[PDB]
Design a protein around this ligand. Structure first.
Ligand SMILES: OC[C@H]1O[C@H](OC[C@H]2O[C@H](O[C@H]3[C@H](O)[C@@H](O)[C@@H](O[C@H]4[C@H](O)[C@@H](O)[C@H](O)O[C@@H]4CO)O[C@@H]3CO)[C@H](O)[C@@H](O)[C@@H]2O[C@H]2O[C@H](CO)[C@@H](O[C@H]3O[C@H](CO)[C@@H](O)[C@H](O)[C@H]3O)[C@H](O)[C@H]2O)[C@H](O)[C@@H](O)[C@@H]1O
Ligand SMILES: OC[C@H]1O[C@H](O[C@H]2[C@H](O)[C@@H](O)[C@@H](O[C@H]3[C@H](O)[C@@H](O)[C@@H](O[C@H]4[C@H](O)[C@@H](O)[C@@H](O)O[C@@H]4CO)O[C@@H]3CO)O[C@@H]2CO)[C@H](O)[C@@H](O)[C@@H]1O
Ligand SMILES: OC[C@H]1O[C@@H](O)[C@H](O)[C@@H](O)[C@@H]1O
Ligand SMILES: [Ca+2]
Ligand SMILES: [Cl-]
Length: 496
């Protein structure tokens, strides 16, 4: 449950949010495999309700109508093909499992669904599953409205309707079994694990009863007896009635404190300074590292009013975002997820983006292909953060240093900091309003190393900055506060 089941030596996964299956299959072969990425989190592959107002928002995919593999991302054959092709080049697939709920109780009866299944939400009728009224928590929820009226009552949070979505009666074996049958189909196709959407809104024990029914992973690609990787989306920033620790027995848990706190520090809000990161990890009150899934932003909070609010860093804040992602990927805490986004027209009305609904790049509702430019960037308004040099190379850094302890911390008492990972990597940041020019102990063997932030190692040369490390392990680092990327990273495989 806790082990990611990635190929040995691969330590991150990337969220290819709203990507089509054919494009992911390609990306696996041409890019993710060769560049050392461990896996891909995909958008929900099951049939969802079509929302015409607003027009085809990203969030319609969090409103299931059946477990047919038929969505704007593709059909079943395309899904299967993607899973086979990615696994064959060493890149795992993790599915976003939406299992707390079906679609909104107020949606109209009809075949306005991505595969044309019929449903009647007002009658709690989903014949393509099938579910009926006795399969939902209407009778269990104790609130007048039927929704969640207070988050300090765990019963409401779990048994009542989250934003009007029909809440499945997860204590029933029939419902557990229908969900296990869906997940097991996906496991047998070859998926390696699951993000469990909205885990806070389920009882830990009901999730457990579902997980206990799940097949071992497909032995074409995995060792016998392998269990699916589970990570559960529980938003817990502290001082709530439900805690992330209630879910430790099922798998890993999203640690939303991580991005919220890191964003605040990198931005230097609320008195925070990079030097306070000396004890980052359990030292800041985070869950145990072996239970954590971490990330700087996710698909919801990158829109600015989710867990962490305005402090969350994103591709819109490119320069500081790269700093935060860099720090994350260098630091030993947790298992790391990298985000990959699309661009949308933000429109702020009283500190609120009213276009936060907008779905992926599309032609009249049909998702656009991901095009690759000569310079290796993406077109068609896909951001492709995972292809930015600074991020891809820090993904490799994490692979190279995997297993090495945190070591050789230095700081200037403010926002210049550095640390290493055993004797295989070192990274230095300047987030202060003045120059960094200091000779630091790196822990690395003497030699000449390419900085993998400003460039790459190509044959027996570096395309960016080079760092000469003395025989005693020291080197001089000079970073202006006006540097494009105000940090430098060197590792064992960037050595000339
Ligand atoms: O009821 C039919 C209804 O269907 C549509 O959707 C309704 C609501 O869905 C959308 O919300 C999406 C979230 O923005 C998105 O973040 C995600 O949610 C995930 C969340 O971020 C994450 O943390 C987590 O753990 O999982 C969540 C889901 O997986 O996906 C969401 C669902 O698609 C809209 O953004 C949201 O605002 C819509 O809600 C609006 O209408 C509903 C229903 O009236 C309101 O609920 C309230 O009124 C009800 C009246 O009885 C009451 O029962 C309920 O308890 C009240 O809370 C809601 O507050 C309001 O904003 C269409 O949007 C809608 O037009 C259709 O009628
Ligand atoms: O200008 C501000 C607002 O405009 C945008 O939303 C639009 C939609 O995109 C339009 O198509 C239209 O909505 C239609 C809708 O397409 C149609 O289905 C119907 O709605 C049904 C609904 O589907 C059904 O599930 C049930 O609940 O009953 C509804 C019937 O009332 O009728 C709609 C029009 O009444 O209009 C809206 C404009 O409000 C924009 O995306 C919004 O974000 C924005 O607020
Ligand atoms: O299985 C765990 C159980 O926790 C209980 O507190 C809930 O009331 C029940 O619905 C759930 O099944
Ligand atoms: Ca629930
Ligand atoms: Cl998440």
């Amino acid at each position: 449950q806790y082990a990611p089941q990635t190929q040995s030596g691969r330590t991150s996964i990337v969220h290819l949010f709203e990507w089509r299956w054919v494009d992911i299959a390609l990306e696996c072969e041409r890019y993710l495999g060769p560049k050392g990425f461990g896996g891909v989190q995909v958008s929900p592959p099951n049939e969802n309700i079509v929302v015409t107002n607003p027009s085809r928002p990203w969030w319609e995919r969090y409103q299931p109508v059946s477990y047919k593999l038929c969505t704007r991302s593709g059909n079943e054959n395309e899904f299967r093909d993607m899973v086979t092709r990615c696994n064959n080049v060493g890149v795992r697939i993790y599915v976003d499992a939406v299992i707390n709920h079906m679609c909104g109780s107020g949606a109209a009866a009809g075949t306005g669904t991505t595969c044309g299944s019929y449903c009647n939400p007002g009658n709690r009728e989903f014949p393509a599953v099938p579910y009926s009224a006795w399969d939902f928590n209407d009778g269990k929820c104790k609130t007048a409205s039927g929704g969640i009226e207070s988050y300090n009552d765990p019963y409401q949070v779990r048994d009542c309707q989250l934003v009007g979505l029909l809440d499945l009666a997860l204590e029933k074996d029939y419902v557990r079994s229908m969900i296990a049958d869906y997940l097991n189909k996906l496991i047998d196709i070859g998926v390696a694990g699951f993000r469990i959407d909205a885990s806070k809104h389920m009882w830990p024990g009901d999730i457990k009863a579902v997980l206990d029914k799940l097949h071992n992973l497909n032995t074409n690609w995995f060792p016998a007896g392998s269990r699916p990787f589970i990570f559960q989306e529980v938003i817990d920033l502290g001082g709530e009635a439900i805690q992330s620790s209630e879910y430790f027995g099922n798998g890993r848990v999203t640690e939303f404190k991580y991005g919220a706190k890191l964003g605040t520090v990198v931005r230097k809000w609320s008195g925070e300074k990079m030097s306070y990161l000396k004890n980052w990890g359990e030292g800041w009150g985070f869950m145990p590292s072996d239970r954590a899934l971490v990330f700087v932003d996710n698909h919801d909070n990158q829109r600015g009013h989710g867990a962490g609010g305005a402090s969350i860093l994103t591709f819109w804040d490119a320069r500081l975002y790269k700093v935060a992602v860099g720090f994350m990927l260098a630091h030993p805490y947790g298992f790391t997820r990298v985000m990959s986004s699309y661009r949308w027209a933000r429109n702020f009305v009283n500190g609120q983006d009213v276009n936060d609904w907008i779905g992926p790049p599309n032609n009249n509702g049909v998702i656009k292909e991901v095009t690759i430019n000569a310079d290796t960037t993406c077109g068609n308004d896909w951001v492709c953060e995972h292809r930015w040099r600074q991020i891809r190379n820090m993904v490799w850094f994490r692979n190279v240093v995997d297993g090495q302890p945190f070591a050789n911390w230095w700081d200037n008492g403010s926002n210049q900091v550095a640390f290493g990972r055993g004797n295989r990597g070192f990274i230095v940041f300047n987030n202060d309003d003045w120059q960094l020019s200091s000779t630091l102990q790196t822990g690395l063997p003497g030699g000449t190393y390419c900085d993998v932030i400003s460039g790459d190692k190509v044959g027996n040369s570096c395309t960016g900055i080079k760092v000469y490390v003395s025989s005693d392990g020291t080197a001089q680092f000079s970073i202006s506060n006006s540097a494009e990327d105000p940090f430098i990273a060197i590792h064992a495989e960037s050595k000339l």
